[PDB]
Amino acid sequence: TATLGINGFGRIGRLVLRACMERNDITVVAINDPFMDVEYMAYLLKYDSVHGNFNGTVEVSGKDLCINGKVVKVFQAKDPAEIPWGASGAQIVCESTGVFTTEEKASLHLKGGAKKVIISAPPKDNVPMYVMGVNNTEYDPSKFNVISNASCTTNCLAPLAKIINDKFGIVEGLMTTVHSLTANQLTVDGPSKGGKDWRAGRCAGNNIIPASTGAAKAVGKVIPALNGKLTGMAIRVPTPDVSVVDLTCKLAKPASIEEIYQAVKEASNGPMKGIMGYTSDDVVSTDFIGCKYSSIFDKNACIALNDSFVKLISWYDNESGYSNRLVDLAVYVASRGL
Amino acid sequence: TATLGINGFGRIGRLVLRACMERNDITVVAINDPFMDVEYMAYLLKYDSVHGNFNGTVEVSGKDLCINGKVVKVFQAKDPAEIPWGASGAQIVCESTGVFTTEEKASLHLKGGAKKVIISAPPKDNVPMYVMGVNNTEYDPSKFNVISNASCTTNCLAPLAKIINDKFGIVEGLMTTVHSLTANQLTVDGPSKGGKDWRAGRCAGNNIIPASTGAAKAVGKVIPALNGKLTGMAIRVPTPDVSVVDLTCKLAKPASIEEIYQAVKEASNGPMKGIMGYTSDDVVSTDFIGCKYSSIFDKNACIALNDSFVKLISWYDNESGYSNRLVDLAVYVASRGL
Amino acid sequence: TATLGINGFGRIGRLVLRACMERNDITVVAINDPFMDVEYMAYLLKYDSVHGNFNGTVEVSGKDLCINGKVVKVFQAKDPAEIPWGASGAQIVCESTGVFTTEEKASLHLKGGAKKVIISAPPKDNVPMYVMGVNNTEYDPSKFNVISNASCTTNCLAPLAKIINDKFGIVEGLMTTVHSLTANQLTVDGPSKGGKDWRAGRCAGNNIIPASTGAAKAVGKVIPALNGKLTGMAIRVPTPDVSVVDLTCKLAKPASIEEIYQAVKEASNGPMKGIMGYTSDDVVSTDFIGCKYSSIFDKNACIALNDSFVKLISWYDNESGYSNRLVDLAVYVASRGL
Amino acid sequence: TATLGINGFGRIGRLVLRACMERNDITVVAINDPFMDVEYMAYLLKYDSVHGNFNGTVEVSGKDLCINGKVVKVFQAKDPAEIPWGASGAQIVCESTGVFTTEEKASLHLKGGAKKVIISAPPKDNVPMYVMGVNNTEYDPSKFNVISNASCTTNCLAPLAKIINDKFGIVEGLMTTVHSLTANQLTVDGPSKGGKDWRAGRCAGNNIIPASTGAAKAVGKVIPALNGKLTGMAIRVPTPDVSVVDLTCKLAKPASIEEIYQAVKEASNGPMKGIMGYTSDDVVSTDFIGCKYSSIFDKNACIALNDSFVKLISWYDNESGYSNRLVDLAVYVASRGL
Ligand SMILES: NC(=O)c1ccc[n+]([C@@H]2O[C@H](COP(=O)([O-])OP(=O)(O)OC[C@H]3O[C@@H](n4cnc5c(N)ncnc54)[C@H](O)[C@@H]3O)[C@@H](O)[C@H]2O)c1
Ligand SMILES: NC(=O)c1ccc[n+]([C@@H]2O[C@H](COP(=O)([O-])OP(=O)(O)OC[C@H]3O[C@@H](n4cnc5c(N)ncnc54)[C@H](O)[C@@H]3O)[C@@H](O)[C@H]2O)c1
Ligand SMILES: NC(=O)c1ccc[n+]([C@@H]2O[C@H](COP(=O)([O-])OP(=O)(O)OC[C@H]3O[C@@H](n4cnc5c(N)ncnc54)[C@H](O)[C@@H]3O)[C@@H](O)[C@H]2O)c1
Ligand SMILES: NC(=O)c1ccc[n+]([C@@H]2O[C@H](COP(=O)([O-])OP(=O)(O)OC[C@H]3O[C@@H](n4cnc5c(N)ncnc54)[C@H](O)[C@@H]3O)[C@@H](O)[C@H]2O)c1
């Protein structure tokens, strides 16, 4: 049974813990976050403005947390090397602070005794990215101690792109993701951290905000065959959670929406079960809150100009789907020997 | 000077009036709306959650309105034929009820003394559509008494599509328009008007909602050369006003974003002055509230996969841009003889 | 087991059905709504932006619905007297259309064979109002066949006022309820249904909107001793669900927030179990979505100027609390003999 | 002509500058904000998600700004003592960083050459607070070099309380302010800066959030006669700007809503012109965006239980009203002798 330690108990960090609490093949044993006292952590875990009250019990036991009768050690270290993961028995660390996305920084968790590290975001350097159901079996435990679970958008696009490319072939594609807001955004017009993404610093509650994303490009690394064939952008909107991918692509072989739908269905019911999903109902974003799939094809919203040029629509709970995939990755990593 | 009569004093009708009050080449002489007393009409004109207080004075004078010292006759006819446009001195009628989108119905305004009628939406029949700066000069007064100003989305896409197709040639394109809130969506999950668009009946305040749009095809009627080369859809988000068009297309001639940008700029400073606009700043939706342009190219938001496959982003205040275009068309129609 | 018929399959009608599906002492056997196709009814029950997916199975069976393998008859009678409640086996009717709020109209259901009717709103005439945990045992089956479950605001305020008045005595009080959005409001500035409340017709998504409410005075009828001692108003804000009562009162007997808290605690763990609740945590509105309590005291939000002038804060999921109470009342009504 | 220097170019700092640009008796000569490049500053002044595009011109000149022709020196000092106010010719400094709310920290501006300092918030120590139209004439230049313009909420309540206390006398009162969000709140559930106000760290876009505020008590300092007679709390909501005060008070002398209205009317058209305002229209929050009044009485929203127990409703653009008052205070200070 793999043990997990969480650094950065934020949106992703807390949902990863919630996912672990629902499984018997992985146990959370420690959490670190310098911006939260143990009482604050208990509070943020218990209540969620999007996913409801925690399904179980949360209590402070001395300096630590007692979640569902299990003891979870708490730390407040500003630097990863200062967290006693080993002494705590944490084998794999979910690096979800958003501030240590390189091998150099993320590897600091190793000094602390961790055996493996999973960055909950695409890396800034060459750390390998894996997407469950697409290329995770490529992971080599003898070569990597620090890996990446990519982004929420890449986890939505990769599985779909794989299915389409395998069956029909993607000549070229452009993507736009209408994405719900994130912690990086601001409630009122203000300066963005580091003064880089100016648009991201504009009132999140009343603006449609164009944004950059490397998700489409990253798919070209997770699926080499698609290198240089995809690129995209993002549009941030006021909703608290759930996003949607709009993939416009030219196919190498003709395909109707019905045929694309059938290909997605065969994949979802077989090799990508639990990862790729689909629907034919008149859904809207809130219907996916809490959905654990990485990508859900919206049949009725897809459109096609002709048999080779189509626009595919796929939903994803950027918080829930991604967190469950990170947990799946952690379990997979454990199964391959730490 | 042309005199205008407004049927349906809704979001569009009211903005059209506000636009006229600012111009000397056109005067609003009458308003008709059976769903609101004169007192309520005055209230709706003086206060607006998106465009602010009315710039001027608004008084109730008997059964009519005194706006900026001018008399505006008010009527509560339910049937377009019962409205005394001629007696009021109304030459052109702005048909903005959204219920008379056919020449048969819309033509009823002529039985009241009105000479011309402009439907503030795409017609359900064969009524000709005109987009200012694109095909309005094709209008012939001796052949049509009832015309259409198309839709807000069409007025944003058509200008852009024309510049791009003229300069580089559009082989095929797919559009997605992210729309702000409209008068059809619901505040809470409830029955849709007609029980046809189920998604549109879902809570608009906390949902991303896929929707249909005929704009892409309408552009194929406004610009015959693009007939059958475009199609699209919409995605509604919880913002009060301002929308954006995401146009993904394959070009005939290779073109960089810089060149596309330069081409828009030339048209914007020339044959489409006041219609086509452009920006290179990190703008967000709220920056366009009140903007009178039909379409505003967002240079930094555009992205290109190759020199022949690009995604263009263009903003448009779905209310202000469109309304001002309808008044421009009214003025144009009058300049051609009634 | 008591059987329920639902007239008006709106927000309340649907949640009433969801509430019944979880209980074994009451079953919905029929639904009537002439402005909603069964296919759409199935859709609205299956999906909800606020309460999530329906916990169970909903299928269209001919012209009726099959819910959890049970046939629920569906009608389209615009006139209550035309609904075959009796033939359908419906004993008690949940009148939730919002248009038959008088004894004259509501009693038409009796012509259809129903034995009792519960109006899901305060009546326009003198139909008796009952609030579970407050005055429902005053219901006399031999004298009334038509009753009212009052309003969501009243169900929140009445239990709290009863506790405070019983223990300390309320000399006089003023209430303000901050309400989350409801169907009544509009997504954009426009005419209100009836043209009475101009403010209510303003854009609900970006406005704080003052409004009227008779809940404070209704409490004076539900609790006679408080007649003439309470009055109040409402303030609508752009949040999807869950509201809060802000009660400012002068007490006849001195009391600290701690003692008021204990009094509420006693009631909540005693005579008002499942009706009145309480919390000492730093909660926010979303933490109550789905909560079945009628009123939840927020200890930390309460404030006192002195020992006899206090401001008490109580939360309520205006949809979930109210609906579960209506069902409780239906079960209570049946237990008293039909 | 008074000169102004601004430290903390945030919501208030930028609106203070905007207010100045519209006046001929005061000029901004310098701005300091370490989290903004001169280009970023130009951008944030040029665009505003709530108050629209800047009315005038803004260009980067070397390392400074050129606003409407006037040159404005730009600094990036994190430590107040390091800002060369004196050399820049800035006489009065607007301390709007939100982090230097004490005489000790704020007075550090004097070391740079500034002559007077105004903290744009209530102080954490004994720095005197002044509310234009209420007690600003009690200012004494020979006594203080550092003063406070109190809070936005206090500027709304103080004028109203003074009028009511002067005319009828306030026995006791409890206040609740429904407040739009601020920069302190978060877009998604997270840890509040400092680990204090936990509720303030909950998703701002979809929650009704109770909060503390010393504004009511502060009124007791600005109006000694009211010390110990008022207190209150706040309720934060998703709107970007504009707030409303709900004052429930017991009057020493009986008074009707009409009489209270007349008293505010007299004050508004007399001693408090430009400060206290009133309305009898069906207004909503957006109608006050850009309003320069400190407090606007909503006659129709007020309600009374008796002749001595009333609930008064008063609006205020927390950003615009306050900023203009701060500028009014700066001019008043200059007129007293620097
Ligand atoms: N929000 C999403 O839907 C989503 C989806 C996929 C991936 N991600 C990625 O996951 C990461 C976290 O995202 P999030 O949305 O949960 O952000 P968040 O802001 O909600 O949480 C980040 C946490 O990091 C903590 N933190 C900051 N510095 C720290 C330090 N030195 N040590 C330990 N903790 C520290 C913060 O206190 C916070 O609790 C980011 O890299 C993000 O891009 C986010
Ligand atoms: N909202 C937009 O941004 C936008 C943009 C482009 C085009 N349009 C089109 O413009 C039209 C109006 O849109 P809107 O958003 O202003 O709608 P709206 O709901 O705000 O107003 C419609 C008005 O029609 C009135 N009406 C109904 N029957 C009438 C009758 N018989 N005579 C006179 N008035 C009558 C209503 O009382 C109402 O005031 C629609 O056809 C719409 O599709 C809207
Ligand atoms: N929304 C709340 O949180 C809440 C809380 C307490 C009380 N209430 C009250 O409950 C009632 C219903 O509220 P709601 O939000 O569900 O309304 P709603 O607008 O969501 O639904 C009303 C339903 O009435 C139906 N209807 C109209 N005429 C009908 C007829 N002749 N026969 C059958 N159905 C008919 C409509 O088709 C619709 O489905 C109202 O009186 C309301 O004031 C609502
Ligand atoms: N927002 C309101 O409606 C309102 C109303 C009344 C009073 N106030 C008070 O005004 C102050 C500012 O409020 P705001 O909403 O504009 O905040 P804000 O977050 O919008 O702006 C604060 C600015 O301070 C800057 N800053 C931080 N440290 C600095 C430093 N060392 N030197 C110079 N600048 C620095 C930030 O970069 C930012 O631009 C606070 O004290 C607040 O409580 C705000």
What secondary structure, in 3-state letters, does D139-207 show? CCCCCCCEEECCCHHHHHHHHHHHHHHHHCCEEEEEEEEEEECCCCCCCCCCCCCCCCCCHHHCCCCCC
Cβ–Cβ < 8 Å for C154, C230: no
Task: Give the whole-angstrom CA distance, residue C309 versus residue D305.
Answer: 16
- The residue type found at D267 is A
Contacts of D36 in chain A (CB under 8 A): 191, 195
Q: Which residue has the tokens 């206390």?
A: D165
| Cα nearest neighbour of B304 on chain A | A231
- Which DSSP category does A129 fall into? B
In sequence order, the 6+-apart residues with CB closer than 8 A to the CB of C76 are C32, C33, C34
| Residue C308 in contact with partner chain D when CB distance is under 8 A | no
Cβ–Cβ < 8 Å for A251, A167: no
Task: Give the whole-angstrom CA distance, residue B218 versus residue B228.
Answer: 10
Residue A17 parent element (H or E)? helix A11-21
C46 by Cβ neighbours in 10 Å (0-12 / 13-18 / 19+) ranks as: middle
Ligand 2 contact via B176 beta carbon (within 6 Å)? no
Task: Give the whole-angstrom CA distance, residue A211 versus residue D117.
Answer: 40
Task: Give the whole-angstrom CA distance, residue D106 versus residue B222.
Answer: 63
CATH 3.40.50.720 residue spans of chain D:
1-149+319-338
Pick the catalytic residue from A94, A152, A249, A302.
A152
Task: Give the whole-angstrom CA distance, residue D315 versus residue D200.
Answer: 22
Cβ–Cβ < 8 Å for C149, C326: yes
| Cα nearest neighbour of D38 on chain A | A195
CA distances from B214 to B157, B234, B240 (A): 12, 9, 22
Task: Give the whole-angstrom CA distance, residue B190 versus residue B188.
Answer: 6
| Residue D289 in contact with partner chain B when CB distance is under 8 A | yes
B135 marked as binding residue = no
Residues of C involved in catalysis: 152
Q: Which residues pair with C246 in a beta bridge?
A: C176, C313
Could you give the angle at the alpha carbon of A35 between the alpha carbons of A32 and A36, nearest 5°?
70
Q: Whose CA is nearest to atom 41 of ligand 1?
A: A98
Query: How close does chain B come to A113, measured CA to CA in Å?
Result: 43
Q: CA torsion sign, B315 to B321 to B326 to B328? A: negative
Structure tokens at C238: 């752009």
- Which residues line the pocket of ligand 4, CB cutoff 6 A? A 190-191; D 7-13, 32-35, 78, 96-99, 120-121, 151-152, 182-183, 318-319, 322
Q: Whose CA is nearest to atom 31 of ligand 1?
A: A78
Q: Whose CA is nearest to atom 2 of ligand 2?
A: B319
- Of D196, D43, A97, A262, the closest CA to residue B280 belongs to D43
CB contact under 8 A, A206 and B303: no
| Residue B187 in contact with partner chain D when CB distance is under 8 A | no
| Cα nearest neighbour of A49 on chain C | C286
Pairing, β C230-236 against β C309-316: unpaired
CATH 3.30.360.10 residue spans of chain A:
150-318
Cβ–Cβ < 8 Å for C232, C215: yes
Chain centroid offset of residue B223 CA: 17
Query: How close does chain D come to A138, measured CA to CA in Å?
Result: 35
**Ligand 2 nearest atom to the CA of residue B32, by list position:** 33
**Ligand 1 nearest atom to the CA of residue A99, by list position:** 28
Pick the catalytic residue from B20, B66, B94, B152.
B152
Structure tokens at B93: 């009628």
- Which DSSP category does B278 fall into? E
Quickly count: other Cβ atoms within 10 Å of residue C62's Cβ. Answer: 9
Chain centroid offset of residue D290 CA: 13
Task: Determine the residue of B78, B109, B120 to mutate for testing ligand 2's pocket, defined as the one with the most ligand atoms within 8 A of the Cβ atom.
Answer: B120
In sequence order, the 6+-apart residues with CB closer than 8 A to the CB of C49 are A284, A286, A287, B188, B189, B202, B203, B206, B207, C240
Give the 3-state secondary structure of chain C.
CEEEEEECCCHHHHHHHHHHHCCCCEEEEEEECCCCCHHHHHHHHHCCCCCCCCCCCEEEECCEEEECCEEEEEECCCCHHHCCHHHHCCCEEEECCCCCCCHHHHCHHHHCCCCEEEECCCCCCCCCECCCCCCHHHCCCCCCCEEECCCHHHHHHHHHHHHHHHHCCEEEEEEEEEECCCCCCECCCCCCCCCCCCHHHCECCCCCEEECCCHHHHHHHHCHHHCCCEEEEEEECCCCCCEEEEEEEEECCCCCHHHHHHHHHHHHCCCCCCCEEEECCCCCHHHHCCCCCCEEEEHHHCEEEECCEEEEEEEECCCHHHHHHHHHHHHHHHHCCC
SS3 B122: coil
Chain centroid offset of residue D28 CA: 18
- Of D252, D251, D250, D218, the closest CA to residue D234 belongs to D218
In sequence order, the 6+-apart residues with CB closer than 8 A to the CB of A260 are A164, A168, A297, A302, A310, A312
Query: How close does chain A come to C258, measured CA to CA in Å?
Result: 22
CB contact under 8 A, A283 and B199: yes
Query: How close does chain D come to A150, measured CA to CA in Å?
Result: 21
Which chains pack against D, by 3+ Cβ pairs within 8 A? Answer: A, B, C
CB contact under 8 A, D233 and C301: yes
Task: Determine the residue of D33, D50, D94, D319 to mutate for testing ligand 4's pocket, defined as the one with the most ligand atoms within 8 A of the Cβ atom.
Answer: D33
Resolution in A: 2.0
In sequence order, the 6+-apart residues with CB closer than 8 A to the CB of B141 are B116, B333, B336, B337, B338
**Separation of CA D308 and ligand 4 centre (Å):** 40
Structure tokens at D134: 């209420």
- The number of CA neighbours under 13 Å toward the Cβ of A165 is 22
In sequence order, the 6+-apart residues with CB closer than 8 A to the CB of C126 are C103
Q: CA torsion sign, B255 to B261 to B267 to B270? A: negative
Structure tokens at D164: 């009511």
CA distances from B247 to B177, B190, C326, D267 (A): 8, 32, 51, 57
Structure tokens at D20: 């100045």
Task: Give the whole-angstrom CA distance, residue C32 versus residue C97.
Answer: 10
Cβ–Cβ < 8 Å for D201, D191: yes
Task: Label residues C97-132 b or e (16+ Cβ within 10 Å = b).
Answer: beebbebebbbbbbebbbbbbbbbbbbeeebbbbbb
- Of C272, A62, D44, D82, the closest CA to residue B282 belongs to D44
- Of B142, B87, B97, B113, the closest CA to residue B6 belongs to B97
φ/ψ (deg, to 5) at A295? -155, 135
Task: Label residues B64-90 b or e (16+ Cβ within 10 Å = b).
Answer: bbebeeeebbbbeeeebeebbbbebeb
Q: Kindly give the interhelix angle for C320-335 and C152-167, rounded to the nearest 10 degrees.
A: 80
CB contact under 8 A, B52 and D290: yes
Quickly count: other Cβ atoms within 10 Å of residue B140's Cβ. Answer: 9
Q: In chain A, after which residues is the C-to-N distance over 2.5 Å, breaking the chain? A: none
| Residue D214 in contact with partner chain B when CB distance is under 8 A | no
A291 catalytically annotated: no
Task: Give the whole-angstrom CA distance, residue C76 versus residue B246.
Answer: 43
Task: Give the whole-angstrom CA distance, residue B325 versus residue B317.
Answer: 12
- Of C125, C167, C120, C142, the closest CA to residue C276 belongs to C167
Q: Which residue has the tokens 């370490």?
A: D34
Q: Kindly give the interhelix angle for D38-46 and D11-21, rounded to the nearest 10 degrees.
A: 70
SS3 D330: helix
In sequence order, the 6+-apart residues with CB closer than 8 A to the CB of D142 are none
Task: Label residues A100-114 b or e (16+ Cβ within 10 Å = b).
Answer: bbebebbbbbbebbb
- Which DSSP category does D33 fall into? -
- Of B263, B267, B266, B268, the closest CA to residue B253 belongs to B263
- Of B288, D9, D239, B287, the closest CA to residue A190 belongs to D9
The CATH topology of domain A150-318 is Dihydrodipicolinate Reductase; domain 2 (3.30.360)
Experiment used for this model: X-ray
φ/ψ (deg, to 5) at C128? -65, 135
Domain A1-149+319-338 has CATH 3.40.50.720: yes
Q: Kindly give the interhelix angle for A152-167 and A320-335, rounded to the nearest 10 degrees.
A: 80
CB contact under 8 A, A43 and C290: no
| Cα nearest neighbour of C53 on chain A | A287
Task: Give the whole-angstrom CA distance, residue A12 versus residue A101.
Answer: 15
**Ligand 1 nearest atom to the CA of residue A155, by list position:** 6
